[PDB]
Write a structure and sequence with these properties.
heterodimer, A: 237 residues, alpha/beta, Nucleotidyltransferase, domain 5, Acyl-CoA Binding Protein, 2 domains, six-stranded mixed sheet, 6 helices, 18% strand, B: 300 residues, alpha+beta, Substrate Binding Domain Of DNAk, Chain A, domain 1, Serine Threonine Protein Phosphatase 5, Tetratricopeptide repeat, five-stranded antiparallel sheet, 41% helix, Pre-mRNA-splicing factor 8 (chain A), A1 cistron-splicing factor AAR2 (chain B), mRNA processing (chain B), phosphoprotein (chain B)
């Protein structure tokens, strides 16, 4: 069934599962034409497919060429996401295929279900959580590899860097979603917090800075404070 | 014109014949229904005064034999039976007529309602959906479940409707996932019409039979089947023009005939709004659309 606050811990058991987020698959800029009409220009996008237990991210880059000469692109984006997720599952060895796929938006259920008809024992599930995975393109290294791509490309990452050497999946996921929530609500502030101190660097093979444990506590508190300030501003509370 | 005699009427029961119905009192001298139009299937059905649950009944065609009704006090229901002694049967029918103990099938001459509801329904196909091959007539009731329902328990009592499922390999060609799911023309014309039903008339016949089972017995799986077969056509971009025009007539007489008070359980809101207003065929069911709007605007 649907994933919600109650069955949240299922994400960290030993049944292999993936989140799929399609928010950054079809990305456009909107502009005025010479005659003054509005037009869109597509930019490169990505499917965000994440194993929340291990941190393995399967970042499928969606090159603008896949839209060429296609109509109803936002609808096609859903089916292309499902096609690419299905191909990912097919490429994985049997013992690595997920038992569940959790789509962050309900409009993905039917396309994925139809694309996964060959895998009837993989459960496709919606979620009631308001996950901040659209802010993935606020992670500089992910945005960079997406924008530089000149063709369809899959890039693998661990979105948790090396955190799991020291904390649990549950804690790693809560940190990831806190970072992304902050980046979603106020990107400039969030990124300032992360990078202020030039003496805490990001390893070449990592996405986030190499904070010590104490420094992650200070970071997380700063992200919390950011998120609550922005709330009061949004709602006049 | 043919006759279905009744041995007796020992329990108070509402009897239906096609779209007509009569109240019969406990041990009322009732002995059958005469003047039944040859050339169509028919359905005789029952609702006991004591149990407004389980409507039940029998589909038959008088060209296939001499049929009569007899109450069984063990099993507690009016049973259809076949009399193989042709003389003995004309004998019973004539005596009961002379004694005038039979109601007349009350067809108004202008009325094509029953023809229009049963145009494509053939007794031979009914006996494949309701498999019980020692009888020439077919029993259906409120509670019988369909083969598709059973999948998601007793197969002897199943409605063997053709399984339609929009998210199945059958419906979806590999590599045409999106195309085939948004435009079901492949599933309709190649898989269902050319493959399984062989022609449009057998499809319409199963569609009409499902509708009538849902109307007369409140059979919920039949209602599911009727809506599925509508939705398959309406969700296909490429339908023979003759099927569209015939569908509009078929659905029109079904909506016309439905009891006004039952429109809430018998009409799936989603399917109808999708068929009439969103689908490829939104513009091709003018009669059905006009009668739906003027009669059940609330559902829409």
């Amino acid at each position: 069934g649907a994933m919600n606050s109650s069955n949240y811990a299922e994400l960290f058991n030993n049944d292999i599962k993936l989140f799929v987020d399609d928010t950054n698959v079809y990305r456009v800029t909107v502009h005025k034409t010479f005659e003054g009409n509005v037009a869109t220009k597509a930019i490169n996008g990505c499917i965000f497919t994440l194993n929340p237990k291990t941190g393995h991210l399967f970042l499928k880059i969606i090159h603008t060429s896949v839209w060429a000469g296609q109509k109803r692109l936002s609808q096609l984006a859903k089916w292309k996401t499902a096609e690419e997720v299905s191909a990912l599952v097919r490429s994985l060895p049997k013992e690595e295929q997920p038992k569940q796929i959790i789509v962050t938006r309900k409009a993905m259920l039917d396309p994925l279900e139809v694309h996964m008809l060959d895998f009837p024992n993989i459960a496709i599930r919606p979620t009631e959580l308001r996950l901040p995975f659209s802010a993935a393109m606020s992670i500089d290294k992910l945005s960079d590899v997406v924008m530089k791509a000149t063709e369809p490309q899959m890039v693998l990452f661990n979105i948790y860097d090396d955190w799991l050497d020291r904390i649990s999946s549950y804690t790693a996921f809560s940190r990831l979603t806190l970072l992304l929530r902050a980046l979603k609500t106020n990107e400039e502030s969030a990124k300032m917090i992360l990078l202020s101190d030039p003496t805490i660097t990001i390893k070449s093979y990592h996405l986030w800075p190499s904070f010590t444990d104490e420094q992650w506590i200070t970071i997380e508190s700063q992200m919390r404070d950011l998120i609550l300030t922005e709330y009061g501003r949004k709602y006049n509370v | 014109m043919n006759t279905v005699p009744f041995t007796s009427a020992p329990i108070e029961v509402t009897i239906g014949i096609d779209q007509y119905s009569f109240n019969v009192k406990e041990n009322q001298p009732f002995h059958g229904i005469k003047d039944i139009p040859i050339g169509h299937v028919h359905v005789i059905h029952f609702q006991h005064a004591d149990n407004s649950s389980m409507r039940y009944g029998y589909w038959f065609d008088c060209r296939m034999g001499n049929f009569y009704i007899q109450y069984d006090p063990k099993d507690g229901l009016y049973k259809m039976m076949e009399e193989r002694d042709g003389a003995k049967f004309e004998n019973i029918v004539h005596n009961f007529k002379e004694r005038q103990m039979m109601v007349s099938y009350p067809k108004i001459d202008e009325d094509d309602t029953w023809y229009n509801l049963t145009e494509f329904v053939q007794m031979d196909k009914i006996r494949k959906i309701v498999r019980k091959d020692e009888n020439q007539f077919s029993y259906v009731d409120s509670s019988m479940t369909t083969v598709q329902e059973n999948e998601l328990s007793d197969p002897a009592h199943s409605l063997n409707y053709t399984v339609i499922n929009f998210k199945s390999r059958e419906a979806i060609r590999p590599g045409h996932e999106m195309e085939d799911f948004l435009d079901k023309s492949y599933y309709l014309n190649t898989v269902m019409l050319q493959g399984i039903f062989k022609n449009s008339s057998n499809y319409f016949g199963e569609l009409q039979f499902a509708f009538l089972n849902a109307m007369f017995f409140g059979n919920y799986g039949s209602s599911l089947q009727w809506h599925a077969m509508i939705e398959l056509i309406c969700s296909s971009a490429t339908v023979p023009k003759h099927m569209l025009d015939k569908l509009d007539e078929i659905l029109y007489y079904q909506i016309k005939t439905l009891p006004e008070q039952y429109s809430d359980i018998l009409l799936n809101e989603r399917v109808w709004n999708i068929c009439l207003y969103s689908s490829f065929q939104k513009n091709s069911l003018h009669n059905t659309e006009k009668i739906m709007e003027n009669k059940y605007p609330e559902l829409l």
